[PDB]
Ligand binder design. Structure first.
Ligand code: CA
Ligand code: CA
Ligand code: CA
Ligand code: CA
Lengths: 149, 96, 31, 40, 39, 38
């Protein structure tokens, strides 16, 4: 993951990290996070900044190091590379072309695979997948079930 | 005492029962239609109980899926709810 | 000793929008 | 592009078995008479 | 064995379901009051 | 009776789940739309 990135991408991520790391100590503080955001224009809460750092920080000590900042960017663009691959194979799966996955359309997949399952288990599959509750799985949800590991 | 001895020899039981049929039939002590009704009811029940064994298993295999398709989804929405709770917390509480 | 069972669900959870990542994607286009 | 269509079914291969994996854990806590003894 | 489960499966779920209705409603009502501030 | 009460409990839960699934989605869509404005 981290070693898969090119040296030019790491240098670009180092430049982005160095802009956030105003002190240059290798760790991102809560005050530095607000200072970057204040230059942009928005004024968030300090409690949100600590919560935002804690989600990003793996150990959650309140400081974000450079390898943590490199890991999130590597994971994000790996998803977008997958997202480019998902949408082309989604069009192949979507034989109707409407962008909505019907239950009968999904049942044609395991016939090509040989896996046998009941019809109402497919109904369980689409209800867990569906979020808006329309009964048909859309394209943006198909990314959600694929990118999540 | 014959029954315990016969347990070690399952194929020997069938020959004795078949021999038992012939002795009864020669002296007219076995009605075939009355015998067949006992056999047909037993084998239909045996077929039904195997289906019942499937019926209990087919029910229980899909019963626990329904109870687990709900508890997994009941926590996924609650995980979403906790994500929604951060920004509504910053909003002030209504009077009523 | 008693401990939580900690059963992993089927669909991995999503994450909230990270603002420091949202700030990074914005300036990249101008840079 | 052929691997893209297959990797989705490969991704779906794990999720389908996990659906049936959810059955046996609930069944195990039910089929035990020990747990029924707790309910009593 | 199943009848004890029918009470037991629901008691764990309905208590969560009873918990589920209030937590969505308070998020529903507070956001519905925001719409009055919108216009 | 087991097979009918097995199927209808699946049908009853799906009818209750559909109401649950639509109301939480609207709450997500309402408040996130304010993030783009600010
Ligand atoms: Ca710092
Ligand atoms: Ca750290
Ligand atoms: Ca379609
Ligand atoms: Ca959908």
């Amino acid at each position: 993951m981290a070693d898969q990135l090119t040296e030019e991408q790491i240098a670009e991520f180092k430049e982005a990290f160095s802009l956030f790391d105003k002190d240059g100590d290798g760790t991102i503080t809560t005050k530095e996070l607000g200072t970057v955001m204040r230059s942009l224009g928005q004024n968030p809460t300090e409690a949100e900044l600590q919560d935002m750092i804690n989600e990003v920080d793996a150990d959650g000590n309140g400081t974000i190091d450079f390898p943590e900042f490199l890991t999130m960017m590597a994971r994000k663009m790996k998803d977008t590379d997958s997202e480019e691959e998902i949408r082309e194979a989604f069009r192949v799966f979507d034989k109707d072309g409407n962008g909505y996955i019907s239950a009968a359309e999904l049942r044609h997949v395991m016939t090509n695979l040989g896996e046998k399952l009941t019809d109402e288990e497919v109904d369980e599959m689409i209800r867990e997948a569906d979020i808006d509750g329309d009964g048909q799985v859309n394209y943006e949800e198909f990314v959600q079930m694929m990118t999540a590991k | 005492d014959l029954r315990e001895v016969l347990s070690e020899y399952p194929q020997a039981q069938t020959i004795m029962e078949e021999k038992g049929r012939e002795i009864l039939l020669k002296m007219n002590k076995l009605d075939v239609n009355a015998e067949a009704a006992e056999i047909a009811l037993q084998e239909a029940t045996e077929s039904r109980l195997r289906g019942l064994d499937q019926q209990l298993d087919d029910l229980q295999t899909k019963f626990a899926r329904l109870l687990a398709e709900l508890e997994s989804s009941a926590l996924k929405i609650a995980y979403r709810i906790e994500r929604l709770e951060w920004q509504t917390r910053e909003w002030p509480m209504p009077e009523d | 000793k008693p401990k939580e069972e900690k059963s992993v669900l089927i669909l991995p959870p999503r994450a909230g929008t990270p603002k420091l990542f949202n700030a990074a994607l914005a300036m990249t286009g101008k840079m | 592009a052929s691997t893209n269509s297959a990797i989705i079914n490969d991704r779906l291969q794990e999720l389908v078995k996990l659906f049936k994996e959810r059955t046996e854990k609930v069944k195990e806590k039910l089929i035990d008479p020990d747990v029924t003894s707790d309910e009593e | 064995t199943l009848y004890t489960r029918f009470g037991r499966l629901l008691a764990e779920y309905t208590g969560a379901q009873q918990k589920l209705k209030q937590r969505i409603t308070v998020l529903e009502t507070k956001m519905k009051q925001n719409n009055e501030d919108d216009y």
